Amino acid sequence: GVYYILQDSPKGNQKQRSLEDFVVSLQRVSTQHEKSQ
Amino acid sequence: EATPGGGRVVPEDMLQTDTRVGLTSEEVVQRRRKYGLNQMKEEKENHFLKFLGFFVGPIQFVMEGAAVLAAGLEDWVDFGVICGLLLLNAVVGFVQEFQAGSIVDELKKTLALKAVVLRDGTLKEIEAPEVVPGDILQVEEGTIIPADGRIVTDDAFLQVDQSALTGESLAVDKHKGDQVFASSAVKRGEAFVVITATGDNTFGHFTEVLNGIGTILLILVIFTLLIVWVSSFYRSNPIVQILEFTLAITIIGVPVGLPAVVTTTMAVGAAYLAKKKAIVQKLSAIESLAGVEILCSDKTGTLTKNKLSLHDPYTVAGVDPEDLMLTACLAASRKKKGIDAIDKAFLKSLKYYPRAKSVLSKYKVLQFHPFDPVSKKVVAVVESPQGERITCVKGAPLFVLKTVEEDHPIPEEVDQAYKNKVAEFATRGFRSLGVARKRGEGSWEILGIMPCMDPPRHDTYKTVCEAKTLGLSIKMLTGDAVGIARETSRQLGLGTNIYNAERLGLGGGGDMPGSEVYDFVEAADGFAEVFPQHKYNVVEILQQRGYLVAMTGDGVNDAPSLKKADTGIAVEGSSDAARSAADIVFLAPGLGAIIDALKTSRQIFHRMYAYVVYRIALSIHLEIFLGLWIAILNRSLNIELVVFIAIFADVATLAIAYDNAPYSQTPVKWNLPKLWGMSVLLGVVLAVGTWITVTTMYAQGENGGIVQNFGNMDEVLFLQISLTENWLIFITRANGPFWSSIPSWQLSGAIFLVDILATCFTIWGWFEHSDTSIVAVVRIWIFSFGIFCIMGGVYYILQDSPKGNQKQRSLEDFVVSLQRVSTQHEKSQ
Amino acid sequence: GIGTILLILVIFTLLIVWVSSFYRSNPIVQILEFTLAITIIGVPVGLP
Amino acid sequence: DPPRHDTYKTVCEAKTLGLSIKMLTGDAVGIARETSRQLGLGTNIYNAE
Ligand SMILES: Nc1ncnc2c1ncn2[C@@H]1O[C@H](COP(=O)(O)OP(=O)(O)O)[C@@H](O)[C@H]1O
Ligand SMILES: Nc1ncnc2c1ncn2[C@@H]1O[C@H](COP(=O)(O)OP(=O)(O)O)[C@@H](O)[C@H]1O
Ligand SMILES: [K+]
Ligand SMILES: [Mg+2]
């Protein structure tokens, strides 16, 4: 009975969404600069 | 002292009585004041005032008072053992200092700034100090000026790199007859120097941690002594017994030779590193290298070889069918003793039939602008048999077009093909070089690109792979364009986030918000088209985020970056100034040597940290055992036994500097709060074990507790303390569980011998009045092993994106913005 | 990791047993019997 | 007008004393910035007006 009793959308806060946005943005700007106008 | 201190015409103008090339007969010079005047030779090899120096001090005075207050030389039991301990500490300290001073000088010898003077023949070079004053000198493009003095009559300007002894960091361009300052570099130039004031008017971090640790240990010993003296005053103990107690606690508490053995560990590690072809400038660079998190290394010479492969020059151009080879080789310095890596490949690949023999004849050079890093472009003006002034230009493929944009300005037919071909050779991992020629006064044809290629070193890929497991993050620095750098990153598995340095904001920004230029620099796999100033800016930015940066320097251009970096690494083939400004000088090429030195430095730091934790843990252990036992019960260990406990802690420690210590998988640093927490907990565990041992004999009598048949409290405590204290080193010198790495035979033997001696002490009891049973020592060994296991388990259990909040990003943005507005206003509309 | 933590638990139990036997001055044979029983029960021989 | 021969080291030691020296020049920004570079005073010079 003890074993049975204890047996039991944007997935991000500001930090997580900011981190993913930064990752994708740095990828894009790296590509953009690498194009070298 | 200028005129009356060894300077006048006969060491000044009698120098310039011969030609430029020639020097003979250092005659009777009467004074060789050359070897770092009265610094290393000061009181040469005293070798006997260091020995007595270790016999005088605060603790040594306490031991002398102890040895005197033992009724003088009445009996050689207390006096003998106390003087033996004092002599052992003095001898160990002397030997350790001798070893540490006899091996840091061997690294200084292999790194001295050798000085070149040219005589009648091709004299090789002169070892640094033993050069006569008032003698010629040849300072050549990044050499530390060996001797102070003035320039020779020949006309040329050398830009001396200053702010090492003066203020301004800009070009200090002394031209003729000015005061050339010793121990200073030359950014560029070719001049000769006359020596004046050959030795006159020449105008780490683990040590501080050790000093703080020693101060806190002194505080702890004073607190224990205060407890002992107070508790003896309440019991009205005679002064002699109080003095015995305070002597025992002084012996156990203050570590006599902690900084000495730490410096010995550093010196042995530095010697081992120099064996691995990595010479360390200052002994503190070991810890700095162990702590680095980001290694910003130049691609050329470190991540790739300096020999280039040439693949089918792109001779698809206008009227010019094959002039690429001829005009490119026209811009060769052809010294073959100071030429760079680029120059060699042109000559080695001159297997051209039509004119390669006739192209190197009569093309007399008039002007030869050297390769300027800010321009990435070498420009030469030479003569031709036709009489024209062929001004060859060679550099980055885009920069040559930027040069030729004036005449024949950017035709769409050729410019598009040129850009497409340079992009294609970037995709093929080829370094490209463009050449433009000047026949007349109004002709500028574009010749084409030269697809050179320098493959990465055969050990570079796996070295970079393993460097990611070591916690490092390698940031490549290329003067190449972004495409070549990105293809090299793909080849090396270095990740492809390469940003042009000028565009990103290193220096004059491109209105990029300051909070995000720092973020881009921090999370960047490389930096293409980098100038010398961008290196310093990258180092400055990366340290703001809280990193320890190791820079790969080579040449005089990156000297300020090497100084600013936490660990400036002078790579193979560096100039004298680069290695003088660096922290570690390497005599082997490639990133493999750097990573091996990193691992070795981490091992050395692990040895140091393990010993420090050992020493302060057993100090806390034995002080909070003996002081508490004196306070509670007015009893303490026999003075001979406690002296031998101290001795055994100086025998199992002269071997820690020589063992197979593992290296951390992450950059290692002094976490002083965690160090103190771990050591206090280990000492408390040891003290609890010892208190259990003694309270067993209180509970069940002197020969009935932890002892089975017979014994005595003092020798049993001696054995237990010795075993549990010396075995503590096996758990501090490990990554996680103590059974991970096998200790070296030296440490294991030195500790097992001490354990055997302690066991013999207990069995025969030859410093107290009774012996101990052979089964009692077995039980003590079992209990000590249990304490060792629980202590090791405690040690093992407790062993283990924008990097900013609003405040940090705002601060970085404000810094960059104020820099930009200062520049903007300084422009003054 | 689980085996390491189980070893730590067995060592803690053995330390309790040895300390409590020392305070009672048990003969070494009885202490060895106790430690053998707890070694047998504590460490799982064939978990992995 | 060259800086005094003791000025550079005085400014260097003034940073260890906790001070932060702010120069005030009636000169233009360029001359002030070059003087700051000479003296090791740091180059963030703003026109007052
Ligand atoms: N001696 C040279 N003559 C002409 N172009 C050169 C020379 N050395 C380098 N370059 C070109 O300048 C760019 C990079 O030079 P650099 O900044 O020297 O690369 P590294 O800094 O990695 O040595 C590349 O386009 C390279 O081909
Ligand atoms: N007596 C003067 N006659 C002409 N111009 C002057 C005179 N004194 C200063 N100046 C100029 O005025 C500007 C700064 O003057 P000032 O405000 O006097 O500098 P400081 O305040 O540092 O003495 C500089 O351009 C300087 O050359
Ligand atoms: K440094
Ligand atoms: Mg380079």
Report whether B138 contacts B117 (CB < 8 A). yes
Distances B224 to B229, B614, B676, B731, B826 between C-alpha atoms, Å: 9, 19, 18, 27, 64
Question: B671: alpha, beta or left, given left = phi > 0 and alpha = psi -120 to 50?
Answer: beta
Residue whose CA lies nearest to ligand 1 atom number 1: B342
Cα gap B662→B668, rounded to integer Å = 12
Residue whose CA lies nearest to ligand 1 atom number 23: B300
Ligand nearest to the backbone CA of B581:
3
For C22, the closest of B696, B778, B796 (CB atoms) is B696
Please state the φ and ψ torsions of residue B748, each to the nearest 5 degrees: -60, -45
Residue A34 Cα, gap to closest chain B Cα (Å): 5
- Nearest partner of B296 among B558, B670, B25, B98, judged by Cα: B558
- The experimental resolution of this structure, in angstroms, equals 3.3
B128: Cα separation from own chain's centroid? 23
- Nearest partner of B691 among B755, B787, B793, judged by Cα: B787
B826/D30 CB distance under 8 A:
yes
Cα gap D28→C26, rounded to integer Å = 93
- B396 CA → ligand 1 middle, Å: 7
- Nearest partner of B248 among B630, B713, B693, judged by Cα: B630
Cα gap C23→B705, rounded to integer Å = 6
Q: Which residues of B touch A29 (CB under 8 A)?
A: 499, 520
For residue B331, give the ligand 1 atom closest to its CA. Answer: 3
Cα gap B50→C8, rounded to integer Å = 49
Distances B421 to B310, B314, B448, C25 between C-alpha atoms, Å: 16, 9, 10, 90
Distances B395 to B363, B373, B420 between C-alpha atoms, Å: 20, 10, 18
Amino acid identity of D39?
Answer: L
Interface residues of D toward B, Cβ cutoff 8 Å, are 3, 8, 28-30, 33, 37-40, 43-47
Q: Quick one: DSSP state of residue A30?
A: H
B499/A19 CB distance under 8 A:
no
3-state secondary structure of B431: strand
The tokens describing B394, both together, are 């060679």
Cα gap B44→B663, rounded to integer Å = 39
Long-range contacts of B98-107 (CB under 8 A, 24+ apart): B98/B50, B99/B264, B99/B267, B99/B268, B100/B260, B100/B263, B100/B264, B100/B266, B100/B267, B103/B267, B103/B268, B103/B270, B103/B271, B104/B267, B104/B270, B104/B283, B105/B40, B106/B271, B106/B274, B107/B270, B107/B271, B107/B274, B107/B279, B107/B280
Helix residue spans in B254-334 (DSSP H): 258-275, 285-291, 323-330
Q: What is the best residue among B304, B400, B431, B480 to mutate for testing ligand 1's pocket, by most ligand atoms within 8 Å of CB?
A: B480
Q: Which residues of B touch D27 (CB under 8 A)?
A: none
**Would you please indicate which residues of B are annotated as catalytic (active-site) residues?**
298
For D37, the closest of B166, B170, B818 (CB atoms) is B170
Rg (CA), chain B: 34
Give CA angle at B359 (B354, B361), nearest 5°. Answer: 130
**Helices B78-109, B58-68: crossing angle, 10 deg rounding:** 150
Report whether B500 contacts A36 (CB < 8 A). yes
The tokens describing B197, both together, are 């004031």
Cα gap B268→B290, rounded to integer Å = 15
Structure-solving method? cryo-EM
- Nearest partner of B432 among B410, B454, B404, judged by Cα: B454
For B481, the closest of A18, A26, A36 (CB atoms) is A36
Ligand nearest to the backbone CA of D29:
2
- B823 CA → ligand 2 middle, Å: 23
Instruction: Please state the three-class secondary structure of B777-801 as a single string.
Output: HHHHHHHHHHHHHHHHHHHHHCCCC
Cα gap B501→B488, rounded to integer Å = 17
Report whether B582 contacts B553 (CB < 8 A). yes
**Helices B806-827, B514-522: crossing angle, 10 deg rounding:** 110
